[PDB]
Structure 1
Amino acid sequence: RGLRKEALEELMKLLNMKDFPYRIEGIDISHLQGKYTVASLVVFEDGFPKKGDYRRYKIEQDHPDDYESIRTVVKRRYSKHPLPNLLFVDGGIGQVNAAIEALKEIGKDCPVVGLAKKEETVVFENREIHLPHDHPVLRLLVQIRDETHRFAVSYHRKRREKESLRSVLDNVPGIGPIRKKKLIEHFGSLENIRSASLEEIARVIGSTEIARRVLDIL
């Protein structure tokens, strides 16, 4: 799954970009209360994710300040890395403008586009553009947003997956803490254990009888 060349052309036209959006970078801002904001940065090159170029930025602050976080991210990254042809920010006029002013703060300029927080409305050049549902440019920006979100959500993936696995295993009668922990450490996630054979599960815990119950509950 990538961004269709024809939709990229349509985006180009909408934003009056003179340059084809060959590199698009997108930012999610997600705050961990009392700790730091994690900014997650994705990269599309020629419409496809370039996963090796993905990065995060951490902005230490007890309370959220998404405008400062975007500013900080833009300044940190683009003082070191080349600008993309287009920057996407997951949020509305304020977040887009925060990025633009940060770029100005370091002498830089590139087009910045947003989608207003979950309200599929395009944000560009201090304006909202309200497109019909299913407009191709809307669909394309949502795909970029979905990828920024997917990358953001993956920050806590290993811990979350173990917790979700543990929650299911808590419902297997007779399992016990030691064998529950063995399964969690061995498998890591529900997706992985759901692909295992009875025999693998039985080997991990030393009981085929309990392994059958784990299969029943899965």
Structure 2
Amino acid sequence: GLRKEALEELMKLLNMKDFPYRIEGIDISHLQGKYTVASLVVFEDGFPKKGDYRRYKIEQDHPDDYESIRTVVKRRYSKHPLPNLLFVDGGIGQVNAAIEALKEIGKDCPVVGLAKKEETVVFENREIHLPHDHPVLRLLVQIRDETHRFAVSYHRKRREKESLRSVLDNVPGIGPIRKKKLIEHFGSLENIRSASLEEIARVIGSTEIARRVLDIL
């Protein structure tokens, strides 16, 4: 989680009057020819609150990350209250997009970013360049890492079937129909690795073949 200690230090650095009890963070990721997916995470008292995570889809073939951030802010905060602090995955451009959107809808909350390449902190139209091991820098990196983790999970079910298939393709002498029965039943490698020999065997009608699946898993 985010250290209460470090949350306190963050409040000082950003000159916040209020403790950052609720922090929301945004990742912007684009799927070419389809849409931008904005993934929103929530920390409450420094802990992830996974039930409150949300995504926003902005339909467009080509990325426009600043307009995407603007759209997210207007969509979300027309419905939800503002957090104590909003984190954006990026620097001056991203931070300013969020601030200007907030101004548009008559709302006000602190917005902080982390430059993508330099790990510079962006706040109130300034860069703050901290030493690498500064606790506030580490805290913001933790937020960024959770926004990324949630973002990457948009692809999960697809990625998982594909990785399951790849591992099964090294099982000698199992045909495509049985491999597909396994993929449809288990969905992923983690899932089929929690399964008994008997369970695997029942799905494909063969203990001989299920033993070999277990060998190669």
- Measured against the shorter chain, the TM-score band is over 0.9
Farther off after superposition, 79-88 or 121-130: 121-130
Residues 166-186 of structure 1, C-alpha deviation per residue, up to 9 Å, x if partnerless? Answer: 111112121111111111111
Where does residue 103 of structure 1 map in the other structure?
102
How far has the Cα of 1:63 moved from its partner?
Answer: 0.3
Residues 122-145 of structure 1, C-alpha deviation per residue, up to 9 Å, x if partnerless? Answer: 111222222112211111111111
Farther off after superposition, 186-195 or 81-90: 186-195
Using the alignment, how far apart are the partners of 1:40 and 1:3 within structure 2? Answer: 19
Trace 1:11-90 onto structure 2 (pairs within 5 A).
11-90=10-89
Q: How has the CA–CA distance of structure 1 residues 173 and 54 changed in structure 2, closer, same or farther, with 3 Å as cutoff?
A: same
How far has the Cα of 1:74 moved from its partner?
Answer: 0.5
Using the alignment, how far apart are the partners of 1:59 and 1:68 within structure 2? Answer: 9
Using the alignment, how far apart are the partners of 2:119 and 2:170 within structure 1? Answer: 39
How far has the Cα of 1:151 moved from its partner?
Answer: 1.1
Using the alignment, how far apart are the partners of 2:119 and 2:211 within structure 1? Answer: 46
Residues 72-113 of structure 1, C-alpha deviation per residue, up to 9 Å, x if partnerless? Answer: 000111122111110000111110111011111111111101
Farther off after superposition, 160-169 or 125-134: 125-134
Using the alignment, how far apart are the partners of 1:22 and 1:62 within structure 2? Answer: 37
How far has the Cα of 1:119 moved from its partner?
Answer: 3.1
Using the alignment, how far apart are the partners of 1:4 and 1:192 within structure 2? Answer: 33
Residues 1-56 of structure 1, C-alpha deviation per residue, up to 9 Å, x if partnerless? Answer: x2111110000011111110011000011111111101111111111111121111
SS of 2:107's partner is: coil
Q: TM-score, structure 2 length as denominator?
A: 0.96
How far has the Cα of 1:120 moved from its partner?
Answer: 2.2
Farther off after superposition, 194-203 or 30-39: 194-203
Give the share of equivalent positions with the same residue, in percent. Answer: 100
How far has the Cα of 1:118 moved from its partner?
Answer: 4.4
Q: Where do 5+ consecutive residues of structure 1 fail to align?
A: none
Residues 156-202 of structure 1, C-alpha deviation per residue, up to 9 Å, x if partnerless? Answer: 21111111111111121211111111111111111111222222211
Where does residue 207 of structure 2 map in the other structure?
208
Using the alignment, how far apart are the partners of 1:119 and 1:79 within structure 2? Answer: 33
Q: How many residues align?
A: 217
Q: Where do 5+ consecutive residues of structure 2 fail to align?
A: none
Using the alignment, how far apart are the partners of 1:176 and 1:127 within structure 2? Answer: 60
Using the alignment, how far apart are the partners of 2:67 and 2:86 within structure 1? Answer: 17
Farther off after superposition, 32-41 or 205-214: 205-214
Q: How has the CA–CA distance of structure 1 residues 118 and 194 changed in structure 2, closer, same or farther, with 3 Å as cutoff?
A: farther
How far has the Cα of 1:153 moved from its partner?
Answer: 1.1
